[PDB]
Amino acid sequence: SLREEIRKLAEQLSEKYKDEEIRELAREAAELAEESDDPEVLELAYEALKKGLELEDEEKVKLILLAAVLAARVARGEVPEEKLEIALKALELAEASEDERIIRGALRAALAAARTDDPLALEVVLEALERAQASEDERLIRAILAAAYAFALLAVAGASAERLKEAEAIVKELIAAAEKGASPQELVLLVIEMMVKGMGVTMETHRSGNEVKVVIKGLHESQQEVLLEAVLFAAELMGVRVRIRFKGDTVTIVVREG
């Protein structure tokens, strides 16, 4: 009755947490295990659901469950191995950290990557997370996570291969900048640049005192939503305050190192 026991763990995990994402991942893990005649998929699903009940951090719960679901789907040939590799590397970053910015950033990047099938984009995200894990500097890790997530959002939003290649160049610039000691504000600025280039527009940067103000004209509000999601999450990862203003078709982003 192993598969039914796995389902029981999923029901207790679903009673422990009311979160919609944990409940759906738990339901998917239970169902994939119940549909499997593979005793190793049952083994991983059992242990992932058992650790999920032992962990205190609900964001690490999500990471553990996402990796199990992706592993079960790789066992059925349903998803590319790169998505599992990304989830596992993200889990590795999260388990090495007490900083919830890194834990949440690792999950966001893994979930955003799970939403694209572009092989080129998956390899960029995986290489980014691998470079993060090869770091002792949690400051660099947070910068890389912000860049990887921003890049993955552009892929999910359907940016062209040429624009993703341009965004990938900015990912590399951002990582090199962080290694050289760029400020948190400057790293958030680089994420804005990545999104602006990835959406084919231009930006006008003003630096008054210690603030950075970016005026972006010519974005559709659907593009504005994706850009601001990337930038606001980057600001959370970098511990920087951002304030937004909309005037007409123009978005203005104020970045304060705070």
Residue numbers in the entry: 1 to 258
Article excerpt on this structure:
Several natural systems exhibit ‘facilitated dissociation’, in which an effector (E) can bind to a target–host (TH) complex to form an excited ternary complex (THE)20–26 from which the target dissociates quickly. We set out to design protein systems that undergo facilitated dissociation. We use a switchable target binder (host) and a flexible effector that can rapidly bind to and switch the target–host complex to induce a large steric clash with the target, forming a strained excited ternary complex. We show here that by explicitly considering excited intermediate states when designing coupled protein systems, a broad range of facilitated dissociation systems can be designed.
We used X-ray crystallography to structurally characterize multiple states of our designed systems. For both the AS1 and the AS5 systems, the crystal structures of the hosts alone and of the host–effector complexes closely match the design models (maximum 1.3 Å Cα root mean square deviation (RMSD)). The unbound structures show an open hydrophobic cleft in the new designed state X poised to bind the effector, and the effector-bound structures show that binding the effector causes the two switch domains to register-shift into the designed state Y. Starting from AS0, we constructed a new state X by shifting the two domains from their state Y positions relative to each other (by one heptad along the helix of domain 1 that contacts domain 2), building a new loop between the domains, and optimizing single sequences that could adopt both this new state X and the original effector-bound state Y. This approach maintains the open cleft in state X by introducing minimal rotation from state Y and simplifies the multi-state sequence-design challenge by minimizing the local structural differences between the two states. Transition between conformational states occurs by a register shift throughout which the cleft could remain open and bind the effector.
